[PDB]
Write a protein that binds this ligand. Structure first.
Ligand SMILES: Nc1ncnc2c1ncn2[C@@H]1O[C@H](COP(=O)(O)OP(=O)(O)O)[C@@H](O)[C@H]1O
Ligand code: BEF
Ligand SMILES: [Mg+2]
Length: 702
């Protein structure tokens, strides 16, 4: 048995190795508050300590300001709830002592904390999977597999659906830990053909949905909620996937050093000679949508080998050979569309001198090139009562072409997800475990509409955590008749949530919708309206001193400033009707579905027109939260060690910044209020029915 055998790989890679006066943490330099050393207390007054620094000098500190150091026997503890002192340096210290020993997982009350190693650690083999089967949390070391098993056993024992919510910043480890949860469940609860199809769905969605960014070589540019479905006996019976917030803008623009979606590079590197001539392909350097960032490859990645893996995955899930060729025709067609060069004609209207790129796109898509040309440059628009062809200039022709491209890619992604769900999903499941892998709360140099949607999502998810914690504590105090009072910290989030999504008074999204669905609005009328409603009037909003295009929201994790440019266009997401008509006539069996199937081609109906993008997202998030409220949740907080993608480099400011805003420091302290330590009679106070409660510090003195 590996857990009692001290020679096992389990002991080597997952445990602190087992063999056969007063101190504080202080800053040598007060201008670097996250850099600490150890000092020894040598005397005291009623309100201060005097201690010796590392170089042997005397310094004084107030007793209320002092960060006391825990007894050294606690350095490396598996759950930080055991520590006497929970100040900032003490919590960071325990996480660092563990990281120094390649121990990346640590508990902190309800949280599993996971620090990215940026190297391979051999703790995810089938042999490691087998160790965690049926073990309680306090019976085995911290691990993503441990919380997965606890969720599975709770499903079987309590007959209740479960969820695992995995969060953190870009590059922190959300997607890798999600993959390990699915791996674990497929093993412990699997047979099989179905199980392989669930696992093989992942490379398909990562090829079309992930890309290299400055923060992560395999960054997710969408969110996902994966439901693993089980029969009443506890075996896997199906799965379903929901997708959120795909970054369609990446198809047409990438910042310096980043890439487009992986699939474009996979097709160009991996296609055969026959496929290349049939699709009119060349290298990535010959396509505008791939030749502007200065990066066409990723270190350690072979795009041709990845193309094989993508095609094998498509075969296993069950896409036909004709379906696969049509998918690649759409990817090729998008590249050709990006090479169309609009130029100024005799007047202000655009012309197309060379027809090569237009004809190549038209051939692969199966559309009429003369019809497509007129739809791009001379679309018929309703002006008053007249339907009239309007000759667009170079800027507007190019923007319309970009709109076509983004619509083709977004609709293709939806179709891929729907086809996967057709294979995997069941009408009759008994129970489920859901895993959420979505963008974390983050602040960038520019935050726009998509980032507001992300940070709004995380505001609701943090409220959900705080309300859960409140209910657990309330249950235990009222089950012991201990008549002590405390507040639900979930209530503290409601002001920010209402500022964003409220109806009356109207919030930010409601005002955006009002400006979008009637005429005469601009980005200036929009920002002006937001300030009119909220500046010096809502305590969670700020109008800037100088900027005319930005506004501030006070979130749980701090203030974020957002910009307004293009929000009206983003909320409507327009595409010319003559372009819709052109592609509705396609001879291709997949393209025809992207334009003729209303479940893919259109958002939902609202009034005499359609719902906006913001209203669609509010509804999508509300549906997700309703599902989560029916489950028993589990929480994983992923932490990135530095901003250089390097191992063995745990940077004090990078990590402490995350701990101050990811809820770890605030949460572990909240459970010290009142009476944290409880123990049955057999094993400063208020008497209960079966246990002895005790305020902070009392049990440690005993
Ligand atoms: N537990 C881990 N072991 C080894 N490498 C990891 C681990 N977790 C994260 N990675 C490394 O970090 C990268 C980014 O992780 P990822 O899960 O894609 O981040 P997120 O989904 O939070 O943006 C991975 O591609 C991998 O190189
Ligand atoms: F880049 Be990760 F997927 F947030
Ligand atoms: Mg990810």
């Amino acid at each position: 048995n590996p857990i009692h055998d001290r020679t096992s790989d389990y002991h080597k890679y997952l445990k602190v190795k087992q063999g056969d006066k007063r101190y504080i943490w202080y800053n040598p330099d007060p201008k670097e508050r996250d850099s600490y050393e150890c000092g020894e207390i040598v005397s005291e007054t009623s309100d201060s300590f005097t201690f010796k620094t590392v170089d042997g000098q005397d310094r004084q500190v107030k007793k209320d300001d002092a960060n006391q150091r825990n007894p050294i026997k606690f350095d490396g503890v598996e759950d930080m709830s055991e520590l006497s002192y929970l100040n900032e340096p003490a919590v960071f210290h325990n996480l660092r002592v563990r990281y120094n020993q390649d121990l990346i997982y640590t508990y902190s009350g309800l949280f599993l904390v996971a620090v990215n190693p940026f190297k391979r650690i051999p703790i995810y083999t089938q042999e490691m999977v087998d160790i965690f089967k049926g073990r309680r949390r306090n019976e085995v070391a911290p691990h993503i597999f441990a919380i997965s098993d606890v969720a599975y056993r709770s499903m079987l024992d309590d007959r209740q659906n479960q969820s695992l919510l995995i969060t953190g910043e870009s590059g922190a480890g959300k997607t890798e830990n999600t993959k390990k949860v699915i791996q674990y469940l497929a093993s412990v609860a699997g047979r099989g053909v179905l199980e392989q199809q669930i696992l093989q769905a992942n490379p398909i969605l990562e090829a079309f949905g992930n890309a290299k960014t400055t923060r992560n070589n395999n960054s997710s540019r969408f969110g996902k909620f994966i439901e693993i479905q089980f029969n009443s006996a506890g075996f896997i019976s199906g799965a379903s996937i929901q997708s959120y917030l795909l970054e369609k803008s990446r198809v047409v623009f990438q910042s310096e050093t980043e890439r487009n979606y992986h699939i474009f590079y996979q097709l160009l590197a991996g296609a055969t000679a026959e496929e290349k001539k049939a699709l009119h392909l060349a290298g990535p350097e010959s396509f505008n949508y791939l030749n502007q960032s200065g990066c066409v490859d990723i270190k350690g990645v072979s795009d041709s080998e990845e193309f094989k893996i993508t095609r094998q995955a498509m075969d296993i899930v069950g896409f036909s050979q004709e379906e696969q060729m049509s998918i690649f025709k759409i990817i090729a067609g998008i590249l050709h569309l990006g090479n169309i060069k609009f130029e100024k004609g005799a007047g202000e209207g655009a012309v197309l001198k060379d027809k090569t790129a237009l004809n190549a796109a038209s051939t692969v898509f199966g559309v009429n090139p003369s019809v497509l040309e007129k739809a791009l440059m001379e679309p018929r628009i309703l002006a008053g009562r007249d339907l009239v062809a309007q000759h667009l200039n170079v800027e507007k022709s190019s923007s319309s072409r970009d709109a076509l491209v983004k619509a083709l890619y977004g609709r293709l992604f939806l179709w891929l997800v729907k086809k996967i769900n057709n294979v995997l999903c069941q009408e009759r499941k008994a129970y489920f475990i859901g895993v959420l892998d979505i963008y974390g709360f983050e602040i960038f140099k520019v935050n726009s509409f998509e980032q507001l949607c992300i940070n709004y999502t995380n505001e609701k998810l943090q409220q959900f955590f705080n309300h859960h914690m409140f209910k657990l504590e309330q249950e235990e105090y009222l089950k012991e008749k201990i008549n002590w009072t405390f507040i639900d910290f979930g209530l503290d989030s409601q002001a920010t949530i209402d500022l964003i999504d409220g109806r009356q008074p109207p919030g930010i999204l409601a005002l955006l919708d009002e400006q979008s669905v009637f005429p005469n609005a601009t980005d200036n009328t929009l920002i002006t309206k937001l300030h009119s409603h909220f500046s010096k009037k809502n305590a969670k909003y700020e109008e800037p001193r100088f900027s005319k295009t930005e506004f501030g929201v006070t979130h749980y994790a701090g203030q974020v400033m957002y910009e307004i440019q293009d929000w009206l266009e983003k909320n409507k997401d327009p595409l010319q009707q003559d372009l819709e008509l052109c592609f509705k006539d396609s001879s291709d069996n997949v393209v025809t579905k992207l334009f003729n199937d209303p479940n893919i081609a259109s958002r939902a109906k609202k009034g005499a027109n359609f719902i906006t993008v913001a209203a669609q997202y509010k509804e999508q998030l509300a549906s997700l939260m309703a599902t989560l409220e029916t489950t028993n949740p589990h929480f994983v907080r992923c932490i990135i060690p530095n901003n250089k993608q390097l191992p063995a480099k745990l940077e004090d400011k990078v990590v402490l910044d995350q701990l101050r805003c990811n809820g770890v420091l605030e949460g572990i302290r909240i459970t010290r209020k009142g009476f944290p330590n409880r123990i049955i009679y057999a094993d400063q106070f208020r008497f209960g029915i079966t246990k002895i409660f005790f305020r902070a510090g009392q049990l440690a003195r005993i």
